[PDB]
Design a protein around this ligand. Structure first.
Ligand code: HEM
Ligand SMILES: [Mn+2]
Length: 153
């Protein structure tokens, strides 16, 4: 459980993401793909992009990042009361994309990295701790929904 003050820090930095959702989503994917190339495999639509500049020039990848971050933002804004938003996400990611929980850890790391790279003055230790707790809650709750659908994270 997050305190009200922790949620406020999460949403404070999230408003900064919302000033440029597409750019943040591009940076998060590029970091994710570089740190963990097997995650680029899971994105079988983008597996073929060879360089950072090709990745940045992909309109489809940019649009996909906005779709992803929009769903995450909608979840974060519910401050843990996110069953209705999380359930369809768990359904698609368990039964179609087949994204293990470890890959959600990988993208959580990339989110933290990009947020600290772009917003260090609004993303110090306490804000990082709050965002880490909110992403941990997200991963814990989606893992439980994964199991309800069969097959483990
Ligand atoms: C912050 C966590 C994530 C959120 C909120 C998220 C959200 C979404 C949303 C909203 C879609 C479109 C609708 C859907 O199919 O559910 C989507 C599609 C997808 N996501 Fe995620 N996602 C997350 C993490 C990941 C990770 C970690 C991977 C893979 C390593 C991943 C791989 C995919 C793929 C492969 C698709 C569909 C792409 C296509 O149509 O080609 N997602 N995601
Ligand atoms: Mn993605």
């Amino acid at each position: 459980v997050l305190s009200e003050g922790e949620w406020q820090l999460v949403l404070h930095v999230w408003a900064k993401v919302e000033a440029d959702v597409a750019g943040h989503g591009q940076d998060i994917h590029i970091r994710l793909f570089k740190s963990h190339p097997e995650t680029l495999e899971k994105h079988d639509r983008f597996k073929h992009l060879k360089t950072e500049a090709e990745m940045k020039a992909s309109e489809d990848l940019k649009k996909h990042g906005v779709t992803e971050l929009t769903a995450l933002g909608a979840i974060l804004k519910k401050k843990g009361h996110h069953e209705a938003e999380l359930k369809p996400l768990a359904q698609s990611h368990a039964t179609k994309h087949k994204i293990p929980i470890k890959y959600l850890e990988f993208i959580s790391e990339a989110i933290i990295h990009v947020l600290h790279s772009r917003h260090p003055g609004d993303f110090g230790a306490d804000a990082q701790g709050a965002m880490n707790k909110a992403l941990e809650l997200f991963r814990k709750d989606i893992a439980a929904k994964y199991k309800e659908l069969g097959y483990q994270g």
